[PDB]
Design a binder for this molecule. Structure first.
Ligand SMILES: CCCCCCCC/C=C\CCCCCCCC(=O)OC[C@H](COP(=O)(O)OCCN)OC(=O)CCCCCCC/C=C\CCCCCCCC
Ligand SMILES: CC(=O)N[C@@H]1[C@@H](O)[C@H](O)[C@@H](CO)O[C@H]1O
Ligand SMILES: CC(=O)N[C@@H]1[C@@H](O)[C@H](O)[C@@H](CO)O[C@H]1O
Ligand SMILES: *[C@@H]1O[C@H](CO)[C@@H](O)[C@H](O)[C@H]1NC(C)=O
Ligand SMILES: OC[C@H]1O[C@H](O)[C@@H](O)[C@@H](O)[C@@H]1O
Ligand code: ALF
Lengths: 324, 815
């Protein structure tokens, strides 16, 4: 009669753990002992990584090319001397940061048609209506629509090594390998129609602010349209008002010489992207890389603080707990 | 005051025997039920947010915000419709019955609901009276009748009422002989023992016989007739005025002790949400005042955001912020509490300890809304005959000792005379030897102001000076009637106040000769005195059905009398030795589970929506949701809404085999502790700390420009995914630390929530369908965990967040 199923009677098998002072105290010591070594490890690794930031936004007559903080509508050049104290040995990566450039805005982070950039034969002639008001110009659809691709960063940075004499020596900068593999290989594909590019974009129009159509970004057949490494790394948003987008990869030499020997250099920049309007600042970050990423001290200090405030608290509670 | 004509003949304005206990009319059930539901503060805020999502702007889909608001309105409405149709069909069986009447010189048989004031009714042996008759004659002489009021007082001893003297000759013999009579009674009253009337029977030409009436001639409704062939009465009260339907008072809407703290939490989170929205909008329009922070040559409104009025866009932005911080208050805490209660009400039914071999049945749960109130009771207003004594019951003494030990205060509101209801109470251990009775019965209060001095002598100079276990009061229906009904005579020295102080200061109380309603008056004063002591009442018969509807959680017993007081009870136990196991092992666990479920359903969402607000300061106050559009929708559904359900449904705070053996534990959750202002601020200062740790400890982590060995940047969706992984792991490990009964289902569900979060992050991102208008989160979760510093940052944050709990454990343990 009485349904005696060991579940309904509220008598299932249980673990019923007992965790308290005498059983958790050694945890406040294992935490310290396993967080202080990792702390010192990732605070020495993040300390033995070199970098440099050379702002060249102008903003002061005392700058090398404040002359272009308010120039005519023509290509501009600078020369921002910078010197390296201790040369770089491993692989060196050149970034290009910005400031007060809200690439995470709502009206901005959605200004893009992903189906189009993914190569949908239909969308190529009829982009969506969200990427506005950069949707259609001259009663035609823009090839990359939206305010993201429209405002691509179109500056050209070039380094020159000044040898023993005044003869500037150029450095090898390779563009391939800067954009996520996942996306460039798959998420970003050219339209399928045909093989030649200029005939794939027939009812298209270069972006308004842009100066050259998308089928002429680079002649290289694998870096020509909707997959141009720089174009991709720009179509990824920033997540903060101050970001730093990979620009070029300098490969470590075969010899044991430093990829960027110490001394003086030239930073020949073709100023184009103006960022003085919105009180922004551009700059070039030359940095190496380690097993855990670029130079960042936070993680080390946080691990050290956590390990220490765990060990100390554990000792305090152990002393008092023994004292009863 | 009312003049009724016996034969109804000359020389209307009163109801016709139609008991109507239901509430909603069949036709207007909805226009009343939906207005009774959408008046609340939660069920209306949910509708406001649903309409705003459907009208202005919604980050998620409108369906995932207005679909629960339908399952919560269609389920409570069905519950109420059914518990109302039950009373409809139970009153249909009390009306439309057979009741014979002498219509015109013959015995017509109409339906009980068609009897009008002033017509000679008839009743055979063992028949519930159709209405308040006035015994007029009887086949036998002596004008006597043996009525047994089992459905009024509740005792079964054979009373005897005397018919009208001069009319004993009428026994089917020309009773329709234009019988001269006119009963001048008094307006209907619930006294049940006082009735002053008069008869004016006129003779052949004219008579002046005036036989004054009393309580001896009154035959109330619901009093079976014993030892008699047939009688003859004249309905004086009939329908909503009889003395059995006057002592009902109706049924109030019972809300648990938790469903008010949930409402206070919701009314505080409404203010938190409004503060968030208003401050964000104000800072947004103080920020957009700089000419070059809105439309800075790289993102420009087409034309509509340039022409749209200034004061309408402010309101639209305020509404967008409100809808975006919608998650603070969770509508998934009601669609979860529904299932929790529905599935928890079964452990009170199946429990094999609530099985009585004699009747061959078990417990019963009529309402699934008061489970969380079995662990909050403070008083127990028992009933003497049938409940306590069937010669006390099997364990009617040990249960009362366990109810005195757990902190409760057991009273006894009986219906028998003071002579017998006192001996039993002296056997149930409720009255020990050295208990100085304060007897206020009618046998010592024969005056009007005498009891006035009695109360003073007892309170201001006998007891109020204090020895809390020596005195035990006793009352009657004649003294308490004055004390209460005449409580509008003194207000500088309130009678009811002096009396309630005495009652609440004694050890145990008793009440002999208590009419059905006076029980509801006592249990209505106790519910109001000095706050809200949660009251309980455990009756057995159809006379207790008033205090069972007036108490907070009315437990009904299934005894010998019948199932008229068990079907109107919020529960059912076929004994008294069960009321210990019911409200010690099922009240504690139920209240603990429900309180933790509420606290967690609020913390798990405050910690979820704090970062999504802090982020507004690093955006342009543009309302850009930090997380993806699928995570905002799936968090409360699959990611973290599975574990807490299983916890709330099966978790013993303290092993039950120890809960019923040591009744002292019930004192730890007595004063609604687990949802007071202390823990509510401990959970609102843990969320408001974890939600800042997550955000700022990832923000400081994004000051490196790269997190992979090959130096590649991370977008703004990896920000969201890192913070969401940290958030889900922390709000699952908090519950994995709080749970102290690990079954085979808790391990499974908890670890499965994490495993499914990981598998879903992997599977949602990695395949282009394509049916998504956007490819935001394509490969974010893989490339995020393909770094070595991300694992370290996350393993550091999931510990900096859980530090407070591990610390509180080590400290709330020693000393
Ligand atoms: C490794 C894998 C391991 C296994 C994991 C399997 C998990 C699979 C999923 C399990 C089932 C889903 C459980 C969901 C529990 C929580 C449900 C809930 O509350 O959902 C609320 C949610 C809204 O959440 P928010 O939008 O955050 O609310 C606030 C908005 N401002 O609404 C919905 O769920 C809408 C979707 C439709 C729900 C339909 C419900 C139907 C009725 C169910 C009745 C259940 C029995 C009731 C008995 C009485
Ligand atoms: C702020 C800025 O530099 N933008 C202008 C834009 O108006 C112009 O159309 C484009 C080509 O001239 O580039 C430049
Ligand atoms: C601009 C360019 O393409 N090459 C220049 C060169 O003309 C310039 O004189 C040199 C020193 O500033 O830096 C680089
Ligand atoms: C570079 O981009 C800016 C902003 O869109 C534009 O004004 C400028 O004309 C461009 N210059 C080029 C294409 O060299
Ligand atoms: O100087 C601004 C320049 O930008 C480009 C055009 O859209 C016009 O706005 C103008 O030729
Ligand atoms: F014993 Al009672 F109502 F007084 F059931």
């Amino acid at each position: 009669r009485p349904d005696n199923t060991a579940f309904k009677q509220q008598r299932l098998p249980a673990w019923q753990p007992i965790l308290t002072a005498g059983t958790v105290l050694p945890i406040f010591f294992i935490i310290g002992l396993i967080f202080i070594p990792i702390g010192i490890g990732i605070f020495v690794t993040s300390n033995n990584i070199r970098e440099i930031e050379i702002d060249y936004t102008g903003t002061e007559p005392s700058s090398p090319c404040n002359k272009c903080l308010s120039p005519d509508v023509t290509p501009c050049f600078c020369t921002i001397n910078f010197t390296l104290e201790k040369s770089f040995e491993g692989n060196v990566f050149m970034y290009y940061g910005l400031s007060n450039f809200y690439q995470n805005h709502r009206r901005y982070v959605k200004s893009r048609d992903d189906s189009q950039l993914n190569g949908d034969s239909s969308a190529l002639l009829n982009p969506s209506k969200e990427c506005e008001p950069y949707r259609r110009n001259e009663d035609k659809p823009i090839a990359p629509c939206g305010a993201i691709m429209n405002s691509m960063f179109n500056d050209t940075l070039e380094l020159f090594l000044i040898g023993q004499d005044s003869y500037p020596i150029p450095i090898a900068l390779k563009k391939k390998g800067i954009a996520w593999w996942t996306d460039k290989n798959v998420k970003f594909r050219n339209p399928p129609g045909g093989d030649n590019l200029e005939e794939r974009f027939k009812g298209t129009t270069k972006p308004v602010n842009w100066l050259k159509p998308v089928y002429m970004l680079d002649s290289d057949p694998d870096n020509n349209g909707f997959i141009n490494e720089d174009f991709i790394v720009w179509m990824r948003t920033a997540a903060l008002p101050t970001f730093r987008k990979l620009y070029r990869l300098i490969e470590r030499k075969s010899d044991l010489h430093p990829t960027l020997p110490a001394g003086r250099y030239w930073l020949n920049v073709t100023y184009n992207y103006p960022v003085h309007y919105f009180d922004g600042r551009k700059r070039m970050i030359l940095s190496t890389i380690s097993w855990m990423g670029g130079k960042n001290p936070f993680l080390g200090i946080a691990y050290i603080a956590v390990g220490s405030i765990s060990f100390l608290l554990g000792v305090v509670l152990l002393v008092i707990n023994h004292k009863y | 005051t009312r003049t009724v004509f016996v034969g109804n003949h000359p020389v209307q304005r009163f109801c016709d025997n139609r008991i109507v206990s239901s509430k909603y009319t069949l036709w207007n059930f909805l226009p009343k039920n939906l207005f009774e539901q959408f008046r609340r503060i939660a069920n209306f805020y949910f509708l406001i947010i649903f309409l705003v999502q459907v009208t202005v702007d919604t980050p998620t889909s409108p369906v995932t915000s207005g679909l629960p608001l339908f399952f919560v309105i269609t389920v409570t409405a069905i519950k109420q419709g059914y518990e109302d149709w039950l009373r409809h069909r139970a009153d249909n069986e009390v009306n439309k019955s057979t009741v014979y009447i002498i219509e015109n010189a013959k015995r017509v048989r109409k339906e009980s609901e068609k009897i009008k004031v002033g017509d000679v009714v008839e009743v055979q042996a063992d028949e519930t009276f159709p209405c308040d008759l006035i015994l007029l004659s009887s086949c036998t002489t002596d004008g006597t009748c043996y009525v047994t009021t089992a459905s009024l007082d509740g005792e079964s001893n054979c009373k005897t009422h005397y018919a009208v003297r001069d009319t004993i000759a009428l026994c089917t013999a020309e009773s329709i002989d234009t019988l001269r009579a006119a009963i001048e009674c008094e307006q209907p009253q619930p006294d049940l023992y006082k009735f002053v009337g008069r008869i004016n029977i006129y003779s052949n030409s004219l008579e002046a016989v005036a036989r004054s009436l009393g309580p001896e001639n009154l035959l109330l409704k619901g009093a079976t007739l014993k030892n008699t062939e047939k009688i003859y009465g004249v309905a004086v009260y009939t329908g909503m005025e009889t003395k059995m339907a006057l002592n009902y008072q109706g049924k109030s809407q019972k809300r648990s002790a938790v469903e008010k703290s949930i409402n206070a939490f919701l009314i505080v989170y409404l203010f938190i949400l409004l503060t968030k929205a208003a401050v964000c909008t104000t800072l947004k329009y103080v920020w957009q005042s700089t000419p070059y922070n809105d439309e800075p040559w790289y993102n420009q409104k087409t034309q509509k955001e340039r022409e749209t009025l200034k004061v309408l866009k402010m309101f639209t932005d305020f509404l967008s912020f409100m809808v975006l911080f919608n998650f603070i208050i969770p509508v998934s805490m009601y669609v979860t509490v529904e299932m929790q209660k529905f599935l928890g009400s079964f452990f009170i039914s199946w429990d094999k300890d609530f099985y009585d071999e004699e009747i061959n049945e078990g417990a019963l749960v009529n309402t699934s809304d008061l489970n969380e109130e079995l662990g909050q009771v403070d008083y127990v207003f028992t009933d003497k005959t049938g409940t306590l004594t069937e010669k006390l019951q099997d364990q009617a003494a040990e249960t009362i000792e366990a109810l005195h030990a757990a902190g409760l205060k057991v009273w006894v509101l009986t219906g028998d005379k003071m002579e017998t209801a006192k001996s039993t109470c002296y056997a149930c251990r409720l009255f020990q030897t050295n208990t100085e009775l304060l007897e206020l019965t009618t046998k010592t209060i024969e005056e009007s102001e005498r009891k006035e001095d009695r109360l003073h002598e007892l309170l201001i100079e006998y007891r109020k000076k204090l020895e809390h276990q020596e005195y035990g009061l006793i009352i009657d229906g004649s003294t308490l009637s004055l004390i209460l009904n005449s409580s509008q005579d003194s207000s500088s020295n309130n009678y009811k106040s002096i009396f309630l102080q005495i009652c609440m200061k004694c050890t145990a109380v008793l009440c002999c000769r208590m009419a059905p309603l006076q029980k509801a008056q006592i249990v209505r004063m106790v519910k109001n005195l000095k706050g809200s002591p949660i009251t309980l009442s455990i009756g057995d018969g159809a006379n207790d059905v008033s205090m069972i509807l007036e108490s907070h959680v009315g437990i009904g017993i299934k005894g010998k009398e019948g199932r008229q007081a068990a079907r109107n009870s919020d529960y059912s136990v076929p004994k008294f030795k069960h009321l210990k196991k019911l409200l010690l092992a099922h009240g504690h666990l139920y209240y603990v589970r429900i309180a933790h479920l509420v606290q967690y359903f609020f913390y798990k969402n405050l910690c979820f929506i704090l970062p999504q607000f802090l982020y507004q300061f690093f955006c342009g106050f543009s309302q850009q949701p930090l997380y993806d559009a699928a995570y905002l929708t799936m968090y409360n559904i699959c990611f973290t809404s599975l574990p807490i359900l299983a916890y709330s449904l099966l978790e013993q705070h303290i092993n039950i085999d120890t809960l019923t053996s040591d009744p002292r534990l019930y004192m730890k959750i007595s004063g609604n502790a687990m949802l007071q202002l202390g823990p509510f601020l401990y959970w609102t200062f843990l969320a408001a700390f974890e939600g800042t740790v997550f955000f700022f400890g990832t923000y400081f982590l994004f000051q490196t420009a790269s997190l992979e060995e090959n130096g590649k940047v991370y977008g703004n969706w990896t920000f969201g995914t890192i913070v969401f992984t940290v958030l889900v792991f922390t709000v699952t490990l908090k519950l994995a630390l709080d749970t102290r009964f690990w079954t085979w289902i808790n391990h499974f569900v908890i670890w499965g929530s994490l495993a499914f979060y990981v598998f879903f992050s992997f599977f949602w991102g990695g395949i282009i369908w394509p049916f998504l208008k956007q490819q935001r989160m394509y490969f974010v979760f893989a490339q995020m965990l393909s770094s070595v510093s991300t694992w370290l940052a996350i393993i550091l944050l999931i510990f900096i967040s859980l530090f407070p709990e591990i610390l509180l454990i080590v400290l709330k343990n020693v000393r």
